[PDB]
Symmetry: D2
Subunit: 142 residues, 4 copies
């Protein structure tokens, strides 16, 4: 059930350690937590490679849409990694595609998408993506 | 998406740490409201198979569009309806509104597949459950 | 265990589906989230313009909790609050959580805020309007 | 005074998440207790053989506390130190401290108590041997 993206389809990977409370009452990682992984993977990259300044930066990215399909369960305390790529890169917006893998492993357990719009921090009006971010996002394309 | 498109409403209060570093409810928390809105209904209305745990719903897909920000301590209202109702699965449509207001701040959906506890093998939706879901179409 | 009449301020707080952990009861970290929500709601409604506009903020420097009886989604909780010690820059809150129809708290704890200038995190005298709000919660 | 690395027996890195940071821009005080929960249960499952899915005996938290000395923020790297202070018939007191990568003095330090109970009834039980051994391995006379 449902075509499962492979590792080679993603341009950048990031390990994320699972926490006790990632598990829900059914004993696996709750479906809401995947979106926390998405947020974490994307912004870590933006901080590290795009020079995103989340404390005092004048430009920030806001999530305007997200989705996720869940293929196979994961559980604390398993080790997981996020694969990340950029699909469409617009003037002020960017579309990420993500997948979660059980480490060293081939087929994604879950895969989804989300969109940042870049905005003036202190107004929240859409801005053209600053170059240093633009180049970090492009590095993740195709 | 407007208030009158949804059939069932649940108020939810925000918590302090709902806000993220940019000062609004983090996008991830909206999914928690989605779940809390649905599972509150299922728990209060969904039958003994739901209530006792022999039959459980697992989320297999979800999504969300964000139109306008909310922030702790704002009180929110979740609107809910059921779109498709299959043999063992259901697709929910939700929208978050601020009190008094017609236009949604945020709107999405998700699917439960219903399954036996032990096996996670898909099961036909129990009748009391089915009734409760059909009531939201 | 603590009783309702030992506190000065009460607020309901509803649970969420994923408050529950793997063992089926509200996870023990969520109780601190309640403490913070209860105190910060009070501060926002009563705390003063220096709180309300954000030049002065409270930071948590210690906290603790005793857990007596479990809580589970979708149970609704009554938070009792009082202020124990009120210093120059800092305040100790005492909280207890109650379920409808148990006399005794299911859980109780405490935490300390230090008030600080937000842009620098340096401790400040508690602003008057805030201090007044806090004093009103001293037994 | 802040606790030091050398005072702890067992260490566990935890990756910070986007939403760990609160509106003041650092890791919220509440999240520290998720680190406590995470560090302790990882150890019980990996070294103690705790079975969180179908085990008959589980640990429940009966008290916990924390002191916070210096802030940390996502996306910093953090490590939990762990030792066992008191070890009783059915209960155990853990001492934990959070350290930034390659820093000797704790950012925060606290404790929590597990009582071990039969899962179905929550009645306290003698700690199972295999778990007791794992806990005793974290006690030092140093």
């Amino acid at each position: 059930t449902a075509p499962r993206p492979l590792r080679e389809q993603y341009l950048h990977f990031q390990p994320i350690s699972t926490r006790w409370h990632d598990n829900d009452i059914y004993g696996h990682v709750n479906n809401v937590t995947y979106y926390a992984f998405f947020d974490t993977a994307v912004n870590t990259y933006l901080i590290e490679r795009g020079g995103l300044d989340i404390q005092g930066g004048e430009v920030i990215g806001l999530v305007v849409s997200s989705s996720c399909d869940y293929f196979a369960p994961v559980a604390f305390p398993q080790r997981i990694e996020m694969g990340l790529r950029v699909a469409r890169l617009g003037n002020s917006s960017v579309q990420y595609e993500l997948a979660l893998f059980l480490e060293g492993q081939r087929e994604a357990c879950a895969a989804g998408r989300f969109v940042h719009v870049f905005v003036e921090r202190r107004s929240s009006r859409p801005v053209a993506i600053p170059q240093e971010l633009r180049d970090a996002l492009a590095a993740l394309q195709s």
